[PDB]
Amino acid sequence: IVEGSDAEIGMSPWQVMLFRKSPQELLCGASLISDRWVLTAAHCLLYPPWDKNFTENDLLVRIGKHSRTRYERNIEKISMLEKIYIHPRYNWRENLDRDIALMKLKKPVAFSDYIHPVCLPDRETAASLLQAGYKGRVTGWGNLKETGQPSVLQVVNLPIVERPVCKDSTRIRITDNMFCAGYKPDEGKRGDACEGDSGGPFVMKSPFNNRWYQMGIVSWGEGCDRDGKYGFYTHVFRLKKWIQKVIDQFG
């Protein structure tokens, strides 16, 4: 996260760390959406241009974390993957369209002050909250700058950006399965996700029920916190049917 702040303890209890077994390293961010399902970005698990194609056995899920590098004894819980599900039309070849995957845990994790699921938006929350100007929040253990590693979970509030501004900011073809967030160069304030923040949650606090919803997944950006550039997030609601379907069918 660039230009963010340290997370408060318990501020993001849905925050998950995708961790590589060997060599032990952070691979990505992710979110807890129930006691057995973790939401992440497709490209965290599969991205042939970088020779990335992770299998279940390659990974651990670390839930409840604060520190980036520490084993947080009695606090974090490390989970094993039973199954990973990538969107069948995840477009890794061109623009990361539909950049979303589910990970089923082997055993359920136990909720706690530090471990708790985020909601997934319904059409009405999406419609009400996914508006230009409305701010969401993004968290991750990724890089502090484009060119670095944070000691604790980083947090940044970023305004959703107008779709045409999004489109005019890049040569990449953007889709309805994406939205962009970030300040405009003259809004002064800045901040963005960066490398290692991938698959982490863009969340918003609904003012109607006071509940945190995950509207986005950290998906892609060109550089990090570059002026006139915006972070791109997987539009979670738009892919919700796939989410429910995968969860309903496989449990």
């Binding site: 961790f19 060599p23 032990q24 390293e25 651990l60 590098t69 520490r70 084993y71 490390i78 094993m80």
Partner: peptide
């Protein structure tokens, strides 16, 4: 590798 060792159990 700058990560503290996790219990060997987790794998």
């Amino acid at each position: 590798g700058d990560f503290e060792e996790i219990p060997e159990e987790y794998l």
